[PDB]
């Protein structure tokens, strides 16, 4: 009697509560599957063309490099692009063997110890293979067909010795450039599919860069496309947007040049403004060495501008003692929180950690004239908004978010992660309709899903 209804109502009410729980997870949107992240997607690269000048004065052996890695992993790089160390006497075809290392650099047993010590810190060594790295023509002007097989035979030897990729430069100087990059990407991937092949080109126009990437879609192509951006970064919004639509938003390296530093192309006021941009664009930034402290090929007399000397401390340049100051060194910029070395260690921290900067999407919207801004977003993680002011004035950014999708649309406030110029408080929320940037200031704003 009394036992009838009240258990039957629980028999109704439990299914009255299960009927909500069984449809709510069906109405809710689910994740899409993460892309298979290879090891170079997970951060930046770092090029060392000259081991003799990275540490200096006869101590440029491969054996002395092992003390530098705990500095070099504080930058949180994910690769290391060591220069051409094979034995090569310049402009001489028969006297160049890519199997044996020049004894000025060390020996074979010193290099194998370097690869082992780099695996403990999760750093992958990418060996350069430019065959004539001392002549002005890099690829042995005559008899080009055996130097193709000299690299093809040496693509097996260093791959069975434990290098983690390869890099060739100046592929505008050999004939049949699009076909030779097809045989070597096969060998480098057919051994294992977590190896790399970074090609390098000097051509700045877009129509020669797409012709290399139409055959192979799995190589990085570093070039000087972003190099001639302008006097004050004039065509930077135009060059970044038009290149990403030319490839259909694929994966691609982002670097100012194939071998040179940052300061061979930019004024010193635009260095902190490009290190913010090169980390947050959808690709692997490829820095050269010295681009984290603002090394300058000028402003020091008696310097080869192809390979400058790194400034570790004030004792780095003994040839001219009064040249190197106390704010131009690695030691002098490590404790200064407003320096340029701290910016490279805060941005490469965010590039390796967050998932929007890792493999999110890219949608740049309209703004005021003279400034560049874009959004970064994965499915439901933290969203990122970069605003770069390329003008020499204090423009107020008028952000017109009228073409963004509904999953990634702008909030009314977003808190400031870091700015490239001191003068704002960090972490506090910041309004978007009244932004009012400074001259040559860049901002990094974050905001959650909230959709």
């Amino acid at each position: 009697r009394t036992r009838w209804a009240l258990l039957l109502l629980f028999w109704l009410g439990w299914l009255g509560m299960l009927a909500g729980a069984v449809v709510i997870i069906v109405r809710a949107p689910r994740c899409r599957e993460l892309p298979a992240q290879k090891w170079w997607h997970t951060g930046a690269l770092y090029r060392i063309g000259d081991l003799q000048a990275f540490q200096g004065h006869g101590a440029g052996n491969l054996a002395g490099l092992k003390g530098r890695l705990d500095y070099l992993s504080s930058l949180k790089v994910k690769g290391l692009v060591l220069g051409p160390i094979h034995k090569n006497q310049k402009d001489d075809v028969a006297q160049t063997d890519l199997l044996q290392i020049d004894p000025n650099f060390g020996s074979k047993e010193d290099f194998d110890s370097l690869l082992q010590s780099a695996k403990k810190k999760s750093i992958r060594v990418i060996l350069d293979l430019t065959p004539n790295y001392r002549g002005e023509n890099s690829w042995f002007s005559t008899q080009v067909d055996t130097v193709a097989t000299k690299v093809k035979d040496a693509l097996e030897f260093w791959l069975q010795a434990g290098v983690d990729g390869f890099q060739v430069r100046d592929i505008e100087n050999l004939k049949d450039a699009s076909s030779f990059l097809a045989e070597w990407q096969n060998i480098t991937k057919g051994f294992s599919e977590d190896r790399l092949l970074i090609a390098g080109t000097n051509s700045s126009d877009l129509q020669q860069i797409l012709s290399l990437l139409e055959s192979n879609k799995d190589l990085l192509l570093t070039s000087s496309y972003l190099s001639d951006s302008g006097s004050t970064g004039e065509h930077t919004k135009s060059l970044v947007t038009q290149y990403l639509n030319a490839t259909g938003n694929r994966w691609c390296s982002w670097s100012l040049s194939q071998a040179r530093l940052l300061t061979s192309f930019l004024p010193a006021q635009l260095l902190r403004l490009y290190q913010l941009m090169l980390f947050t664009l959808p690709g692997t930034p490829v820095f050269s060495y010295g681009d984290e402290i603002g090394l300058d090929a000028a402003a020091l007399p008696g310097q080869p501008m192809e390979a400058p000397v790194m400034l570790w401390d004030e004792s780095s340049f003994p040839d001219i003692p009064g040249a190197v100051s106390a704010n131009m060194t690695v030691k002098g910029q490590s404790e200064d929180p407003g320096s340029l070395l701290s910016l490279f260690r805060r941005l490469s921290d965010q590039r390796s950690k967050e998932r929007s900067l890792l493999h999110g999407d890219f949608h740049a919207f309209s703004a005021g004239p003279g400034l560049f801004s874009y959004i970064r977003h994965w499915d439901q993680n933290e969203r990122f908004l970069v605003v770069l002011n390329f003008g020499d004035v204090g423009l107020s950014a008028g952000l017109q978010a009228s073409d963004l999708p509904a999953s990634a649309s702008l909030p009314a406030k977003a808190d400031l992660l870091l700015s490239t110029q001191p003068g704002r408080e960090e972490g506090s929320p910041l309004e978007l309709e009244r932004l009012k940037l400074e001259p040559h200031e860049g901002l990094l704003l974050r905001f959650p899903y909230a959709a």
Partner: antibody
Amino acid sequence: QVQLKESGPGLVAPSQSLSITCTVSGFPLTXXXXXWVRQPPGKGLEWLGXXXXXXXXXXXXXXXXRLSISKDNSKSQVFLKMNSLQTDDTARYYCARXXXXXXXXXXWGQGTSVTVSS
Amino acid sequence: DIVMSQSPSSLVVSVGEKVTMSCXXXXXXXXXXXXXXXXXWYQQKPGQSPKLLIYXXXXXXXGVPDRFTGSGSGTDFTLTISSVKAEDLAVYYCXXXXXXXXXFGGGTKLEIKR
């Protein structure tokens, strides 16, 4: 040489729109930002806005509601739309030329003496 | 909004008397990341369009005579004519070369004693 020809002065009835032109020569229009400057006679200078190759305006808050800067890329001239002209709009309307985001108006216009009355 | 206040409203000098005119900004016109002062100096002859003389507070424009020297930083600026000529009778203004809303100066009329 850098020449910025201008329409010359125009007379209009009150609360009628005005479009002023700033036809140029001697430089590519898409590579430099063209600004507009208001000056009443016997008084100080006032700044109005900017333009670009993407038709992106940066207006001033005192004169944002009744000004609409436009640029015709074909004939290489820019336009400035007046709206609801009150009697305190009788002034000269200079159209200068600044470098790509520097705000240093080097080559100025010739001047248009807008005079509004019935 | 930066406010520009040009100090002498009207001055009168004779030919070759080394005139100076002062200026003062409300907010500081020195960006302390590049340490370059941001102020401009225009010249308006009577009945003519204005003409740029000095940008970034000390860089004379191309085609300007060397009598016009401008110096100072912070919130004080000064345009100096070394020795005025007969044709330097004009009105001199002040801009704000680093701002969203570029507020111009008040104005200063230069007469000539004879």
